[PDB]
Amino acid sequence: SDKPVAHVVANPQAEGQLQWLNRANALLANGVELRDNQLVVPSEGLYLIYSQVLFKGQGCPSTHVLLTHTISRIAVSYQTKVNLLSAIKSPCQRETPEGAEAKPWYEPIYLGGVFQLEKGDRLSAEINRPDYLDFAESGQVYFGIIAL
Amino acid sequence: PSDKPVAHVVANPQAEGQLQWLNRANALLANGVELRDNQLVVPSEGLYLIYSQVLFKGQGCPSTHVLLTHTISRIAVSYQTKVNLLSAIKSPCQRETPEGAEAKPWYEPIYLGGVFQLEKGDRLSAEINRPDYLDFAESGQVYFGIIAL
Amino acid sequence: SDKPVAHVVANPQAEGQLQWLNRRANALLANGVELRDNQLVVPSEGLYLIYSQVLFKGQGCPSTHVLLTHTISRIAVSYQTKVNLLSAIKSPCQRETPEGAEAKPWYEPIYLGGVFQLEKGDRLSAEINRPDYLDFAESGQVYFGIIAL
Amino acid sequence: ARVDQTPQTITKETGESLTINCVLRDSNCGLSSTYWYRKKSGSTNEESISKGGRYVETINEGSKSFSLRINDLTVEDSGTYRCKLSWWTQNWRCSNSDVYGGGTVVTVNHH
Amino acid sequence: ARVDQTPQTITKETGESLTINCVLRDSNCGLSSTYWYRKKSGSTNEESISKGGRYVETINEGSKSFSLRINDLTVEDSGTYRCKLSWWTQNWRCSNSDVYGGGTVVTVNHHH
Amino acid sequence: ARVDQTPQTITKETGESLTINCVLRDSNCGLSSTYWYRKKSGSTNEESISKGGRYVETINEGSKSFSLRINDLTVEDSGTYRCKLSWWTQNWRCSNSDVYGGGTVVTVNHHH
Ligand code: NI
Ligand code: NI
Ligand code: NI
Ligand code: NI
């Protein structure tokens, strides 16, 4: 295929940090680059952009936990960061009482949309709570684009 | 640029508790697709990726039941029948918030996406059942798009 | 269009089992993609958008922990090896439902989607771990599709 | 725009049960959050009635009516009871103000 | 198709703790909803055991076993205890009927 | 890392209220799980202080401070109170050890 395309996954060797990785069943071809943890657009066009992250906790803490995942666009020239896709989840309504059996929770977030991008645009896929990031299994955390 | 029929509309932030789609920056509506009667109108037969996301938010859990649905439906150009293409249901509240407790907001996004054969003149709708919990206060959270493949 | 494409839906006739069907309206299976052994068969090498949504439902929360998973996996044409492409886990039940209270059902959809390079003859599977909570009673809720881009 | 709480007076003896009913009239809003409060005889503070056990709340959303039954009454159950409606959980509130029923004076005696 | 509840008799003193164990045998079903009930000595009505605090339930799904530990026993804890299994939360139920353990007669005494 | 619990001693009378405050100092970690424990006067066992009713817990995440207020104090509320911080719910824990405040000895007396 000749379409600009990328599909990167979280580094399972990172320590509590969302760091994107290149290649099996991963893609980065036909001009797209991975630079500064961001995907770089090689040419103007319409792109499908998507991403999934997975959160996991052992229980619910005393502080209230809001999980966000956001895909943003940084113009090559204008140094403006604008949110393209974003979502928020709230896994914990009440704090877990002490002394009970560990009952972990899991919370995936999926984002996807079609956007017109310019050459040199930088796309970022970012979360707010790395202390609940779960990338222990393949197929769970990814970030991709493809020109349409 | 591209010549494919494409749309990407977002919720109107001035609407009051209502899901109204608008055509803004980082939004698309080109190559035949129109926005009419809060619906996307298909300009030509073909394969289309259809997708949408809505976000629901509440300050707590009420006494009455809260079932959140988001549905993309197709109205055929010829028979004007509404058929659900994509749908999902979420239930954020198992127990009513006890009195005297602090508001602990909850969030519930619903994402839908699929590929469908559409006909010229088809109208697509993206609708929710509980506008009183709709949350569109931030960009990138509520959107509705199509693109011909 | 000549693109390999599929969009299959859950069979509402199955008993607690995720069985895919093409013959439905607003469903697709064309240009080489085949459905065999409940799996989609890739007709040619290329980049494919792969997606799926499943819906879970329960009448209440049980005492045991309920982890809901949905996985799309790839079986290479040559080897009987299954490797996961896309997967997600959800945990709908934090607290057990007390007996004798309001039957208050819960719903939990899982959506998966990504772009992958597949080979001619690859077989794709979309599977869940808890068929005892599968809900396919309504159209547009459970689907599995691919399209070559 | 008005909550009709009935009956306004109830007199019972120990071991009986009672029912109070509230219905929302003249509103485009439906029932959202419902509450019941009690100010005991002699007390000057209202306490929230936790639903469950002796206290059973039933809700008919279609008719915008909801009721409280208290079983196995005791003398300590005497006081003034009031229902309260709120829409505070909604992101787009149907009404910014709560509405209260008119109140019920409950007296429980021995024998 | 059977729940083996053990032990059948327990005699303890004030302040001690006890453990009752139930195992689901001869079933193609796994554990789903578990409950504990108590009929106190002299009483003729079963009451539900609210899990938490003094009552600690442990579940082992792999062995289809679950147990109830009761700490800080009082004489009022004397009675007959019974576990119950149900599958009513499932959308496609493994079983249409519940199953109960055989019961445990618990006696709690004071010290000398 | 150090948790500054203040004040170290409190003397009140029945019906009054008190507040104990804990602040996480010298740590790159934020507040995660917070708990309060009480060892009553004469007793030698710690019990968890469940938030609600007479007990109101406040949390200020930005200042890493959290507080316990007890309203309508009774003589039985006399004892030693201690806060505890834990990070056990996190998937990537900020700290592998819990940390405790220094404690507060609370004395509640009658009005005469
Ligand atoms: Ni009497
Ligand atoms: Ni004794
Ligand atoms: Ni006094
Ligand atoms: Ni004095």
Swiss-Prot record, chain B:
Localisation: Secreted
Extracellular topological domain residue ranges: 1-149
Residue ranges of every copy of the THD domain listed in the record: 5-149
Domain of life: Eukaryota
Reported impact of L28F: Biologically inactive
Impact noted for substituting A76V: Biologically inactive
S-S bridge residues: C61-C93
Signal peptide (residue range): none
Name of the protein in question: Tumor necrosis factor, soluble form
Record organism: Homo sapiens (Human)
Lineage: Eukaryota, Metazoa, Chordata, Craniata, Vertebrata
Gene: TNF
Residues shown, of full length: 84 to 233 of 233
Swiss-Prot record, chain C:
Effect of E138K: Biologically inactive
Domain THD: 4-149
Cystine connections: C61-C93
Extracellular topological segments: 1-149
Superkingdom of this protein's organism: Eukaryota
Subcellular localization, as worded in the UniProt entry: Secreted
Protein name: Tumor necrosis factor, soluble form
Species this protein is from: Homo sapiens (Human)
Residues of the full protein shown: 85 to 233 of 233
